[PDB]
Amino acid sequence: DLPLDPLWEFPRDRLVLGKPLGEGAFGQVVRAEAFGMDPARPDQASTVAVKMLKDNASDKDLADLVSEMEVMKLIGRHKNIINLLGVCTQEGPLYVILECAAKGNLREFLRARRPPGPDLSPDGPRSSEGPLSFPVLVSCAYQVARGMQYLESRKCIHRDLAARNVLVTEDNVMKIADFGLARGVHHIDYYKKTSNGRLPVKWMAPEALFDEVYTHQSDVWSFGILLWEIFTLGGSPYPGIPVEELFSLLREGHRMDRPPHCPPELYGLMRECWHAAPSQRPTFKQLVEALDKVLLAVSE
Numbered sequence: 001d002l003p004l005d006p007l008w009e010f011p012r013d014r015l016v017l018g019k020p021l022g023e024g025a026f027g028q029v030v031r032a033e034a035f036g037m038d039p040a041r042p043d044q045a046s047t048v049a050v051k052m053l054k055d056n057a058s059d060k061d062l063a064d065l066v067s068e069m070e071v072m073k074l075i076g077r078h079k080n081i082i083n084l085l086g087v088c089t090q091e092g093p094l095y096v097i098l099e100c101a102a103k104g105n106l107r108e109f110l111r112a113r114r115p116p117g118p119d120l121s122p123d124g125p126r127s128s129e130g131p132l133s134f135p136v137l138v139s140c141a142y143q144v145a146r147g148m149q150y151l152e153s154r155k156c157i158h159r160d161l162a163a164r165n166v167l168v169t170e171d172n173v174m175k176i177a178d179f180g181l182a183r184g185v186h187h188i189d190y191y192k193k194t195s196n197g198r199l200p201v202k203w204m205a206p207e208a209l210f211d212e213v214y215t216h217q218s219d220v221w222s223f224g225i226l227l228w229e230i231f232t233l234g235g236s237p238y239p240g241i242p243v244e245e246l247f248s249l250l251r252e253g254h255r256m257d258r259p260p261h262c263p264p265e266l267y268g269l270m271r272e273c274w275h276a277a278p279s280q281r282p283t284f285k286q287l288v289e290a291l292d293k294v295l296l297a298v299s300e
């Protein structure tokens with residue numbers, strides 16, 4: 001039905017759909033096997049993520065997915081974002097074939113890798129040593145910033161940047177997901193809590209929440225929250241604060257406390273990202289440079 005784009009079009013019969021990975025506001029994502037994604041190796045298998053409409057496919061759902069497809073065609077390729085691999089638009093359901101990140105999103109990745117507690121009996125020479133170390137946490141933050149810097153250069157705004165929207169590959173490479181998506185910014189239920197308990201309003205910059213204004217600097221605010229997530233190892237922001245209290249606290253200019261085991265350098269970065277005036281927050285370019293200095297300083 002849709003026009004054929006030979007640049008991106010991929011034979012749907014070269015896809016083998018597997019287990020569903022997750023579902024969104026519009027569309028669901030399914031793990032799948034792809035054969036010959038590289039045209040030079042037609043019989044080579046690869047694992048990809050296929051986005052498709054749900055079965056309650058309204059025409060707004062289709063429009064949103066078509067919109068996401070066109071954004072993915074224009075955004076180009078970068079190491080630190082989920083890249084478009086191909087599409088299926090001819091003679092069958094609309095598929096958007098994306099890169100697959102084997103380790104899930106950044107939040108789940110961090111939460112599954114919290115250090116062993118003092119309730120465990122010491123076994124071996126590394127009893128206290130957890131999977132996560134400080135330089136790696138800094139690297140994760142750096143990669144997200146680089147990816148966001150790239151998206152900004154392509155004039156793209158995320159509007160819901162969070163640990164849950166950052167994906168982790170087999171090689172622990174950060175990949176920003178669901179970047180320039182329609183998210184119904186004129187009808188957000190600020191009290192809406194997701195199935196996993198997330199309150200997305202806690203990631204919104206004040207100008208976005210109060211004035212419905214989204215800029216790259218509003219993403220920087222969200223990045224600050226993401227920084228806090230990272231160094232709490234997947235903690236939920238504004239701990240124990242319901243949305244009603246969040247409203248008043250934000251109007252009073254309240255900010256999150258410095259989390260435990262977090263160096264003042266990084267909490268400093270967080271607070272800069274949460275400066276009230278968007279122009280007094282660092283740019284993503286400055287965030288990359290600042291995080292680079294820390295990363296190089298702890299990479300002897």
Ligand SMILES: *C(=O)c1nc2c(C(=O)Nc3cc(O[C@H](C)c4c(Cl)cncc4Cl)c(C#N)cn3)cn(CCN3CCOCC3)c2cc1Br
Nearest residue numbers: 021022029047049082098099100101102103104105164177
């Ligand atoms: C394939 O590489 C692969 N992917 C995963 C994922 C996974 O999450 N893949 C994934 C999800 C994507 O988007 C969805 C909607 C999503 C989810 Cl499900 C969660 N949070 C954010 C988002 Cl955007 C996209 C996109 N776009 C791309 N890829 C999860 N797993 C398993 C996780 N974990 C593995 C081992 O420990 C137990 C469970 C996989 C596996 C694989 Br092979």
